[PDB]
Amino acid sequence: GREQWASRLGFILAAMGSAVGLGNIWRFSYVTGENGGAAFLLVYLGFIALIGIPIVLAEFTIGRRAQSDAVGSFEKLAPGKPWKVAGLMGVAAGFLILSFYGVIAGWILFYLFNYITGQLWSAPAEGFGGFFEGFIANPTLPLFWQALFMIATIWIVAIGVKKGIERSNKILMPLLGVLLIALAIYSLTLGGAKEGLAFLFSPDWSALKDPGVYLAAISQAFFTLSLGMGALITYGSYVSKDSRLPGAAVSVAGLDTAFAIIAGIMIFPAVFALGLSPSGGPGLVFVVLPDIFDSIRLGPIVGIAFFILLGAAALSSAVSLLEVPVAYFMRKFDWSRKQAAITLGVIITLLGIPSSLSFGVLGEVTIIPGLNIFDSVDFIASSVFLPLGGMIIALFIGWGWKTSDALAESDLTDSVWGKLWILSLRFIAPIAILIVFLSAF
Ligand SMILES: CCCCCCCCO[C@@H]1O[C@H](CO)[C@@H](O)[C@H](O)[C@H]1O
Ligand SMILES: CCCCCCCCO[C@@H]1O[C@H](CO)[C@@H](O)[C@H](O)[C@H]1O
Ligand SMILES: CCCCCCCCO[C@@H]1O[C@H](CO)[C@@H](O)[C@H](O)[C@H]1O
Ligand SMILES: CC[C@H](C)[C@H](N)C(=O)O
Ligand code: NA
Ligand code: NA
Predict the structure, then answer these.
(1) Domain range holding 274?
(2) Number of domains into which the chain is organized
(3) Residue among 187, 202, 266, 272 whose CB has most ligand 1 atoms within 8 A, to mutate
(4) How many angstroms separate the CA atoms of 312 and 20, rounded?
(5) Which residue among 119, 204, 331, 423 has its CA within the 20 to 30 Å range from the CA of 213?
């Protein structure tokens, strides 16, 4: 009845495209930065091995045995039991995260437009930092480019799994990796490599007595791995009988973390050479990356190449953010695919408009005490729904699955990995999440 990926690799690449997006470059930079660098990074790394690798496979496992959307996946496997709250919790993180995902993806298309028209080639008068300030504070200009991005996202989603989502131009994600390695090597010769690589790889332990860093790591880890958004459950619901689930979840985190690391090697050695502070808020990369391209001879070509490849990366990730409601509403309300995309994509766009305004006119306005609207949506989405959603997901398989079924559907045997993966779901990952919950609130 449902559409499916046309090969076992098509599922891997789509999941690779879903995972590797803006949370690798943009979000990883200013979150690693404002939380102490190397202390945070080693904690974010450790969370991906013991909380990440199991839950991605947990999501992949639950995705195909039910062959349903993220919510209906819990209704066809354990009907009547209250586990569907996790499938419900993740779709809410999809509506919330795609609202400001289109906000930051609007910044991508504006900068790309400026490099195409030859505007951001040299250092503007306002400066590479000031240019970003008067742009995110302008009430309407970010909303235009967000709507333009939400078109392609909506368009691709409305096209279909086999005619749109899976048809991602196969050679573009590798082009974004090769460039980042070439961009990482460049900033290493800007005079900030010592202050950068030390702050980014050598730990300052006193930070780990602040509990926010833990929650910050768990928030970033679940966010960069497409966890707790209902996106890995649905991408698993298009996987065929013949497929190895364990190999994909590893291939995705290894690529996402490798992409995540090179971004640190590129951003932070440049932040310390530019004399800039690593805790520069969400628009950290948009102050540094143009400042780095400004010192290259062909920097305008790099900028166009960088933002075309990073834009397509944010496009391949936000398209999957829309499938979670779309694949749900087609079942729950018999909506067609094209009707679901327009309706659910234009609402997600309007939901993010108060976030784009939180950078300028709505700066002093707060919802959650102490945070502006962008930071507040980010909190409930990425620091609550994502870490708490995976806990129920992890406890769901670990406790509410017959161990013979949990390993058979996850294509794991009774090997040490099969036990370890099961072990992390039953106890390790959920308690680490539960402990970080007790220690932050
Ligand atoms: C490419 C991998 C980089 C690994 C960086 C590990 C930590 C580097 O931090 C190092 O701390 C030392 C303290 O005096 C200094 O002498 C070094 O110059 C400094 O780079
Ligand atoms: C290239 C990938 C490996 C990078 C390993 C990073 C090494 C961690 O950094 C270490 O931090 C310690 C202070 O806490 C210092 O005493 C060590 O000299 C330093 O190597
Ligand atoms: C002092 C440095 C003056 C400019 C020397 C050019 C060296 C950088 O070279 C540039 O690096 C980019 C990747 O980083 C590539 O994409 C460009 O094609 C390449 O021209
Ligand atoms: C919302 C997260 C998106 C889908 C992607 N996982 C990223 O790291 O940017
Ligand atoms: Na992507
Ligand atoms: Na990611």
Answers:
(1) 1-441
(2) 1
(3) 202
(4) 11
(5) 423
